[PDB]
Amino acid sequence: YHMLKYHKLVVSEPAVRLIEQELTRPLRNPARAAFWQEREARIGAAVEDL
Amino acid sequence: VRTKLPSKRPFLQTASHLAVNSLVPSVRTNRWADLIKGPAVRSCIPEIPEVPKPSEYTTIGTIEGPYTLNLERVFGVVELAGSQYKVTPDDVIFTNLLHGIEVNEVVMLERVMLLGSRSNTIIGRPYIPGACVLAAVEEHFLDGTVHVFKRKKRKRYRRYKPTRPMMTTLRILKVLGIDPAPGDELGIPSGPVIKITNTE
Amino acid sequence: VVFKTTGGKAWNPPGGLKPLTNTQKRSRKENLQILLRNLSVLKLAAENQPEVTVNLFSPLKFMH
Amino acid sequence: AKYGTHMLESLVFKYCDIGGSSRGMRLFLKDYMDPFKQTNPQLRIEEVQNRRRHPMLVALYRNGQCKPVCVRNLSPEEIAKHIFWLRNSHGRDDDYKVPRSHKVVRNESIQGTWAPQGPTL
Amino acid sequence: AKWQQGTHKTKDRSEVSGGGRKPRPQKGSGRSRQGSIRSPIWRGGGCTFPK
Amino acid sequence: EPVRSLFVTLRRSYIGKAWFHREILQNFRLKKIRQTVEVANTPSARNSLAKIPHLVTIETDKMYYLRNMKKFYEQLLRPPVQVSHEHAALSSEIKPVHNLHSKHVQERLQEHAYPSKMEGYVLHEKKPVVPRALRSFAFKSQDEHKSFVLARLGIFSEEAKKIHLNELRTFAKRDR
Amino acid sequence: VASYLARICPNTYVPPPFVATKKGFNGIGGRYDPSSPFPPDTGSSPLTLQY
Amino acid sequence: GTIFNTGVPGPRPEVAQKLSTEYQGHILRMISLAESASELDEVLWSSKKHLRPVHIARSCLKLEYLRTKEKGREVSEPIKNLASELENYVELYSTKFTIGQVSQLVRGLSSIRRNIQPDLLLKLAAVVVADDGRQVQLAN
Amino acid sequence: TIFNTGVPGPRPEVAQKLSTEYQGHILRMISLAESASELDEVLWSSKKHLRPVHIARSCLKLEYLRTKEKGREVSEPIKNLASELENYVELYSTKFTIGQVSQLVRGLSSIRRNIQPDLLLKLAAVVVADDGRQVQLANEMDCRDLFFGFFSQGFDNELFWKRLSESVLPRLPYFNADVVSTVLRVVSGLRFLHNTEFAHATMTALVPKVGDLSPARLADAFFSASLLDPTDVSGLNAKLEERFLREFTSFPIKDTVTMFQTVTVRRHSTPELAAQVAPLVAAQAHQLPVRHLRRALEGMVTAGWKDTAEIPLYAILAKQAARLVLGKQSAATSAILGKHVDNQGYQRT
Amino acid sequence: XXXXXXXXXXXXXXXXXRXXXXXXXXXXXXXX
Amino acid sequence: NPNYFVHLGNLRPNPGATQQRIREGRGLSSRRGVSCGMGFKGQKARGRSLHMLYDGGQLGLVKFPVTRQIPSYEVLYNQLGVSKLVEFIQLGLLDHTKTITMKELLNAGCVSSLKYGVLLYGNVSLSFPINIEVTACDDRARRSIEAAGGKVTRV
Amino acid sequence: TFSREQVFTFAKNFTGRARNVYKVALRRVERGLQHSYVGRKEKKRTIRSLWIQRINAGCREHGFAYSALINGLNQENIQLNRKVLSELAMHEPDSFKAVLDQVRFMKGQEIYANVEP
RNA sequence: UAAGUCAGACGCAAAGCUACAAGGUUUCGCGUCAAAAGGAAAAAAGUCCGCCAGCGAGGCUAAGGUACAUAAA
RNA sequence: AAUAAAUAAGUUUAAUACCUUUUGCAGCAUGGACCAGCGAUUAAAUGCCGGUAAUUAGCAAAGUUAAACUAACGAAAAAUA
Ligand SMILES: [K+]
Ligand SMILES: [K+]
Ligand SMILES: [K+]
Ligand SMILES: [Mg+2]
Ligand SMILES: [Mg+2]
Ligand SMILES: [Mg+2]
Ligand SMILES: [Mg+2]
Ligand SMILES: [Mg+2]
Ligand SMILES: [Mg+2]
Ligand SMILES: [Mg+2]
Ligand SMILES: [Mg+2]
Ligand SMILES: [Mg+2]
Ligand SMILES: [Mg+2]
Ligand SMILES: [Mg+2]
Ligand SMILES: [Mg+2]
Ligand SMILES: [Mg+2]
Ligand SMILES: [Mg+2]
């Protein structure tokens, strides 16, 4: 609501880093999320070899 | 049978015939009616030809500026927009909306059915070849509102739908095809100056 | 048609159903001539049927 | 046009610059105002910018008729439809209906009206 | 929707003052039959569907 | 000459007919009176038509063709003819219409047939008279404005003075 | 009348009319309707902004 | 009969004892017991929100069994359309299949003379050979 | 309750026309037609609802139908149907779009029918009217059909080609190779465009991307480039020759024969090339029409290849030419079938 | 008879009755 | 502002996501105009009187007998299939080189919420041994695991 | 339901309370609009009746009948309608008589494009 | 549509009850009204012709008519 | 039922309010003297069936709640060697 209300947005360097960190944080079970990322990476590597 | 439940007998019979056909092949493999079936045709009789008619209206030019008209002593009958009109120079007629014409343009009407003067009359059967009527387009207008209303007493039914018809206005300029009777010739200029813009 | 002559509902004028006029009689004669003429035509068609039936085109049959 | 003289005398365009209801009117002026002027050299065209609530069209005829038309929330194609009927008409009132015989003539009889064949009294 | 406060209320016929007694006799007077002066139909009555 | 097809035209309406007779018409695809269809000459089609000889008219291909060709030849254009009627003694005077004295005939001519009222908007402009019952709607906005001004700005205001001056003009014109 | 603009401006070029749909998208066919009161879309659902 | 309405065939005791049980797995049994391509399509359509890779692997395998029943003719239209829809789920779950599930998927689609897209076929191959085939040891 | 006895009989057969509700199915019906007679009936039933889009599409369909009858004269029903579609085009002469005109000309040109000179002028006026405003809206496929369609009709109006070339000139760099090849074919066929700026621009646009040319288009491009530009002002002929050498084995028989003859005209033939051509032409000599057989004979003779015992190509070509002239293939098939009364259509050379 | 009657009507240019080259042979439509 | 700017004054919802409510009793030409679509008279058209399940007095639903059998308490266990246990091991979510307990199953995600225990059931073809401790098991699962050399213990 | 502005615009020429009283005028406005729908239909029937009467009166002055004229016109392929014929009898007696003579006696001189073939 | 309806009426044609009565009553076949404007018979819910999206001073017909009222011998 | 459609302005033709309730109402069946203002399927929780999206949901913050899924017959052989 606030972003659409005002015409201009100004942010600071530490704010940008914090915003991105929260928007990418796992919603649930951090441990489970990592496992699926690793499996996808291994599959991606195998695809390149083939 | 007394019951009002719909009967399932057709469904039960179909399931039996389908099962037999699926498992038991037929003995015959041809049908003569299918073998000699000929090509599809549109009809069994010759088509009826259409009767030609003269052109309804066509543009021939435009009007340059203000003009005046005088009265003449000839008249004719012309068919236009689904209805007939008796016209003489300097008359104003109202018709349905005509497409493809603009104000201050001159049009030519060829479906002439009758020409008359004070000494002779010419009758078309049903049209007279070599006759025409000239007119000027003056208006493309919406007529007065017509209010359409329907109601049914005691039935909670009511409908209102106003509308505005579309029409066209013309002014007759010249009638060609019949000479005026002796002594009835108009010996002065009568019409406007027309810029011809239709050469075929 | 109504033949009943009793009751308060006046389907017919006093005296019952009125007899036909000359025009009504002529009207009924022509209705029967049309019916008889149609039956005569069907007899002509049956006596002059060809061996092979004609096939007529229909857009809806063509699509399916 | 009557006897070759156009009947529409002036056409006024009223609109606002920031109102949303005038969005369609502004588009028409940007794209088709100039071709319209060239087609009608005999018409006096005026544009008025104001702070009124809605746009409007005003037509004035040489016979004294005044026809204001509201073009609120209309597109250029819809606006052009109103202009077509205003320019090509004589501006008669919305309740008027033309004669039912569909013909008005000053010289109705060339050979003479029918008269009884005998001495009248 | 989350920010809306929603502190609003009205009164129905059971919350308006008075109106307990029957104001008119059921029959005989030629007037319409009524049961209470705080009915929604009456000026100063309660709300049919209060907030 | 073999008969290869039949032409069937509908004569009567669906209203008041038994439901087992409407089906036959629907199979032949007849929906309107005077509508015609062409069908193959087969024993099954003839049997169905024999159950409704009173609702339709039936003719063969040859009969249908001959009837329509006879009409076509009759409608072809024919040479025009002329008839002369001599009146040796003719007058040069142009007589007026017999109802020219009527004001209603003149009104139509004034509106459409004459070069009238072409002198400009200013000359012919006129103010319409508001019907008495519609006046509360024509002046609603002006009445609201006067109430708006007096309620918010007061009577000792420049806007209020302007309204009073306009009211003086209206009253003065009542004296005629 | 197919187009009134072609009638009041006999000697100008009139672009093709915009396709009208029940849903009411303004971005059908890679075109943007300037008279629409909403930002351009891609001509389908869900609505996505087209720059 | 007496249990169902007119025209509805009576229950088969063999099928009834499979479906009536205290143990879960209802959806798997429904697809496994399908007798035609149209029937299997209806099962998947009504259970879309609960399909998983195990359900997709069995569905592709069933195409082998339906084709065998309809012998003496080429692959019919309903079989072809059903296979096309199944491919979209294979792409969706291409990164979640096990070695066994991939094996069933390829077998079923191969028996119907269906050519898997090169991009998708490469992904399936990568899953099997990933990690130098150390996961292939845990297969029968 | 029961008013008729027996099993319901067959429904009556009724002749019907297309109703207004199904006006949107006309284009589908044209595609589904499998013969000239069927298409004639489809148009007749829809006569009251025909539009310029339908007339143009029907003429395009003539090409698809005639393809199935390759190797024979155009059938009578196709000619009669074409005689009727022409009258419809005359009525709608001024209501067609640029894309629709391209379809109409291609269809009638494929059937080898000469459009009336007055109709071509009216159709030409539509394309180039309003300073070619609509040409900027025609897509690549429309442009390709316009160039080849009008050229095949013998249209020889200098003004039309001048205006059309000017509008297309800025778009050449972004057209596909196959489209550019067609443009060169027209330029070489028109004498008055031999040494124009448009002709040079076309060559410069084709050189950057030649790997996308198909075998048939590649052969035509080499033929046209050699005729127009004997001296390699632009690196086109040299690049085309290099492609021919690299992929000589992959091209079809017809294109290899045509390209080989062009090389001999260019005077770049070598004994090695002639030796390599012979084994491929001998094996597939039966896949060459009479026109390509003539090209093969001239190319090999010019190259200087001599008859060899292992591969007597000249002997094989002579027999193949005799078969085409005599048309013995139809008779040979009938001999195996056992019905020698089979009708045999042919296109006499 | 249908074929022998369609030809006769087809051999008639009714549109040529409104071309000013006409005489009393362009209206003799029925009996040649 | 250009045309492509987004602000609070040009937002609309996706087509088909919302539909207008029907307000009845608002005119002859409105939907459900006068009588609000309830009919003319009767008990149904006079407010909240009649339950939708009442059948007129026949009371046909209570003409059927009553059963009182108690289902087995094992319906309260969480059911785990042998085929699902293997899939987790193949994907790498379970360690098959050591004893598997219900704690490992809970953390791996095989079982969602345990109150009483885990029931192991089904048939599977195994090639490697598995040692698993559960609360209940059928005979099909025991044979499948022991065929490969595993051990199933009920604790 | 019509609004107050619509009702009073329609009822501006009514009598008594029907002019300015909403309840009275609204019922009078709706009944009047019902009369108009019926009126437009009947107008087309009445006018054609008037044309035929005038045509018949003119025909009998010469010793003819309307029904004989309509049949005679169709045999000559003359397609003048009743509106035009009615106007001819009233305002153009000489042309109306010429039509009758052609139908009855067929003594008109034919006109060809080429006067001298 | 898990909606409304479960008060029906008459004409022609049959049967039971009544008195081979009722604009009566109980079933049954078709049609019309109910929920249907327009035309013919005097006014005309149920009979005869025929099913109204809108406008027009064009044309042909149905049932029924063709010395006046009142369009047409 | 006080209007409508027309007109040469003299006149001519068409035409038994609305609501409610009924098999059927111009009704001799019910309600309204007129004007302005007020006056009647609303809110919460739960369940069922369509539509539109997210692609598990909530907390917490590498760990827990809620839901969902979890064996049915391992049946194909398309090698012009
Ligand atoms: K009837
Ligand atoms: K309801
Ligand atoms: K009052
Ligand atoms: Mg009585
Ligand atoms: Mg009759
Ligand atoms: Mg209060
Ligand atoms: Mg009741
Ligand atoms: Mg009820
Ligand atoms: Mg009529
Ligand atoms: Mg009851
Ligand atoms: Mg009952
Ligand atoms: Mg009774
Ligand atoms: Mg009722
Ligand atoms: Mg008649
Ligand atoms: Mg009379
Ligand atoms: Mg009663
Ligand atoms: Mg009272």
Question: What is chain H's length?
Answer: 140
Task: Report CB contact under 8 Å: I15, F37.
Answer: yes
Name the phi and psi angles at B30, rounded to 5: -140, 160
- In eight-state DSSP terms, residue E35 is S
Question: How far, in Å, are A33, F81, L79 from residue F75 at the CA level?
Answer: 89, 17, 10
Whether the CB-CB separation of B162 and B90 falls below 8 Å is answered with no
User: Which is it for strands D8-15 and D44-49: parallel, antiparallel or unpaired?
Assistant: parallel
Residues pairing with D13 in the sheet = D47, D57
Q: Which chains have 3+ CB pairs within 8 A of F?
A: B, C, D, I, J, L
Q: How far apart are CA B80 and CA B56, in angstroms?
A: 6
Contacts of I340 (CB under 8 A, 6+ apart): I331, I334
Q: State the first-to-last Cα distance of chain B, in angstroms, to the nearest integer.
A: 79
CA of C43 to the centre of ligand 12 (A): 48
Q: What angle do CA K7, K12, K13 make, to 5 degrees?
A: 135
> Smallest Cα–Cα separation from I145: which of I164, I129, I130?
I164
Which two three-digit tokens encode residue I288? 């060459």
Residues pairing with F101 in the sheet = none
Q: Is the dihedral of CA K87, K89, K94, K96 positive or negative?
A: positive
- Whether omega for the bond prior to residue G46 falls within 30 degrees of 0, making it cis, is yes
CA distance, residue H122 to nearest chain A CA (Å): 7
Q: Which ligand is nearest to the CA of C9?
A: 4
Q: Which residues of F fall within a CB distance of 8 Å from J9?
A: 69, 72
Whether the CB-CB separation of B125 and L77 falls below 8 Å is answered with yes
- Nucleotides of strand N within 7 Å of the protein's CB atoms: 1-9, 13-15, 17-22, 26, 34-42, 51-54, 57-76, 78
Most I-contacting residue of B4, B42, B44 (CB-CB within 10 A), to test interface? B42
Q: How far apart are CA E50 and CA E9, in angstroms?
A: 7
Q: How far apart are CA B139 and CA B95, in angstroms?
A: 11
Which two three-digit tokens encode residue B168? 């066209």
Q: Which helix (H) or strand (E) holds B132?
A: strand B132-142
Task: Report CB contact under 8 Å: D77, G1.
Answer: no
Which two three-digit tokens encode residue F117? 């009222």
SS (H, E, C) chain I: CCCCCCCCCCCCCECCCCCHHHHHHHHHHHHHCCCHHHHHHHHHHCHHHCCHHHHHHHHHHHHHHHHCCCCCCCCHHHHHHHHHHHHHHHHCCCCCCHHHHHHHHHHHHHCCCCCCHHHHHHHHHHHHHHHHCHHHHCCHHHHHHHHHHHHHCCCCCHHHHHHHHHHHHHHHHHCCHHHHHHHHHHHHHCHHHCCCHHHHHHHHHHCCCCCCCCHHHHHHHHHHHHHHCCCCCCCCHHHHHHHHHHCCCCCCHHHHHHHHHHHHHHCCCCHHHHHHHHHHHHHCHHHCCHHHHHHHHHHHHHHCCCCCCCCCHHHHHHHHHHHHHHCHHHHHHHHHHCCCCCCCCCCCC
Experimental method: cryo-EM
CA distance, residue G49 to nearest chain D CA (Å): 21
> Which residues of K lie closer than 8 Å to A, measured between beta carbons?
6-8, 91-93, 109
Does residue D28 sit in helix, strand or coil? helix
Q: What angle do CA B71, B76, B79 make, to 5 degrees?
A: 130
Q: Which residues of L fall within a CB distance of 8 Å from J28?
A: none
Task: Report CB contact under 8 Å: B43, I44.
Answer: no
CA distance, residue I17 to nearest chain C CA (Å): 7
Q: How far is the CA of F96 from the C1' of N4 (A)?
A: 34
Q: How far apart are CA B125 and CA L72, in angstroms?
A: 13
User: Which is it for strands K78-81 and K118-121: parallel, antiparallel or unpaired?
Assistant: parallel
Which DSSP string corresponds to chain F?
A: ----EEEEEE-S-STT--HHHHHHHHHHT--STT-EEEEE--HHHHHHHTT-TTTEEEEEHHHHHHHHHHHHHHTS-EEEEEEE---SS-----PPPTTTT-HHHHHHIIIIIS--S-S-HHHH--PPPPPGGGHHHHTHHHHHHHHHHHHHT-SSSHHHHHHHHHHHHHHHHH--
Whether the CB-CB separation of K101 and K151 falls below 8 Å is answered with no
- Whether omega for the bond prior to residue B126 falls within 30 degrees of 0, making it cis, is yes
Does residue B138 sit in helix, strand or coil? strand
Which two three-digit tokens encode residue D111? 């050979």
> Smallest Cα–Cα separation from B94: which of B172, B181, B6, B174?
B172
Q: How far apart are CA I257 and CA I244, in angstroms?
A: 11
Residue type, F50: A
Strands across the sheet with K78-81, in order? K78-81, K118-121, K136-137
Q: Would you tell me the crossing angle of helices H37-46 and H53-69 to the nearest 10 degrees?
A: 160
- In eight-state DSSP terms, residue B14 is H
Residue F1, CA atoms < 13 Å, CB-side half-sphere: 7
| The residue to which tokens 């003052």 are assigned | E17
Q: How far is the CA of K109 from the C1' of N67 (A)?
A: 14
- In eight-state DSSP terms, residue H30 is H
Burial class of F108 by CB neighbour count within 10 A (0 to 12, 13 to 18, 19+): middle
Q: How far apart are CA K129 and CA I245, in angstroms?
A: 64
> Buried b / exposed e across D17-37, counting CB within 10 Å, b at 16+?
eebebbbbbbebbebbeebbe
Whether the CB-CB separation of H75 and H67 falls below 8 Å is answered with yes
Q: Which among K4, K15, K16 has CB closest to G39?
A: K4
CA of B123 to the centre of ligand 14 (A): 23
CA distance, residue A39 to nearest chain K CA (Å): 9
Alpha helix segments (H runs only) across B24-168: 32-35
Name the phi and psi angles at B189, rounded to 5: -60, 145
SS (H, E, C) D58-88: EEEECCCCEEEEECCCCCHHHHHHHHHHHHC
> Smallest Cα–Cα separation from F151: which of F143, F139, F166?
F143
Whether the CB-CB separation of B90 and B134 falls below 8 Å is answered with no
Q: Measure CA C3 to chain center.
A: 23
> Smallest Cα–Cα separation from D90: which of H117, F113, L17?
F113
> Smallest Cα–Cα separation from F28: which of F49, F42, F12, F14?
F49
CA of L45 to the centre of ligand 9 (A): 6
Q: Which nucleotide across the nucleic acid strands is nearest to L19, CA versus C1'?
A: N2
Q: Is A32 on the interface with H (CB under 8 A)?
A: no
Which two three-digit tokens encode residue F143? 């009445």
- Touch between B and K (at least 3 CB pairs under 8 Å): yes
Whether the CB-CB separation of F52 and F24 falls below 8 Å is answered with yes
Q: Is H126 on the interface with A (CB under 8 A)?
A: yes
Q: How far apart are CA L102 and CA B123, in angstroms?
A: 9
Q: How far apart are CA B53 and CA B128, in angstroms?
A: 11
> Smallest Cα–Cα separation from D61: which of B145, K87, F125, H98?
F125
Whether the CB-CB separation of I74 and I66 falls below 8 Å is answered with yes
Which two three-digit tokens encode residue I327? 């048309």
CA distance, residue H118 to nearest chain A CA (Å): 12
Q: Is H135 on the interface with K (CB under 8 A)?
A: yes
> Smallest Cα–Cα separation from H102: which of H120, H119, H88?
H120
Task: Report CB contact under 8 Å: B103, D102.
Answer: no
- In eight-state DSSP terms, residue B150 is E
CA distance, residue I125 to nearest chain B CA (Å): 17
Burial class of D90 by CB neighbour count within 10 A (0 to 12, 13 to 18, 19+): buried
Rounded (to 5) percent helix, strand, coil in chain G = 10, 5, 90
Residue type, B55: S
Name the phi and psi angles at I196, rounded to 5: -100, 170
> Smallest Cα–Cα separation from F40: which of I16, B44, I44, C62?
B44
Q: Which residues of H fall within a CB distance of 8 Å from A43?
A: 95, 123, 126-127, 130
Other CB atoms within a 10 A radius of the CB of residue D109 amount to 19
Residue of H nearest to A49 (CA): H126
Name the residue closest to the C1' of M10 by its CA.
Answer: C9
Q: Is the dihedral of CA I130, I134, I135, I136 positive or negative?
A: positive
Whether the CB-CB separation of B50 and B185 falls below 8 Å is answered with no
Q: Which among B49, B52, B54 has CB closest to J9?
A: B49
Q: How far is the CA of B165 from the C1' of N25 (A)?
A: 40
Task: Report CB contact under 8 Å: G9, D24.
Answer: no
Q: Is H122 on the interface with A (CB under 8 A)?
A: yes
Which two three-digit tokens encode residue A9? 């947005």
* Rg from Cα positions in chain J: 11
Whether the CB-CB separation of F24 and F14 falls below 8 Å is answered with no
> Smallest Cα–Cα separation from K86: which of H29, H101, B141, B195?
H101
> Smallest Cα–Cα separation from H18: which of H8, H36, H33?
H33
User: Which is it for strands B166-176 and B92-96: parallel, antiparallel or unpaired?
Assistant: antiparallel
> Smallest Cα–Cα separation from H54: which of K148, K111, K85?
K85
Q: How far is the CA of L38 from the C1' of N5 (A)?
A: 8
Q: Is B155 on the interface with K (CB under 8 A)?
A: no
- Nucleotides of strand M within 7 Å of the protein's CB atoms: 3-6, 10-13, 21-23, 29-32, 35-36, 41-44, 46-51, 53-60, 63-66, 71-73
Q: How far apart are CA I75 and CA I89, in angstroms?
A: 21
Residue type, L34: Q
Neighbours of ion ligand 1 (CB under 5 A): F 15-16
Task: Report CB contact under 8 Å: J29, F72.
Answer: no
Q: Which among D110, D114, D117 has CB closest to L90?
A: D114
Q: Which nucleotide across the nucleic acid strands is nearest to F21, CA versus C1'?
A: M30
Whether the CB-CB separation of I58 and I43 falls below 8 Å is answered with yes
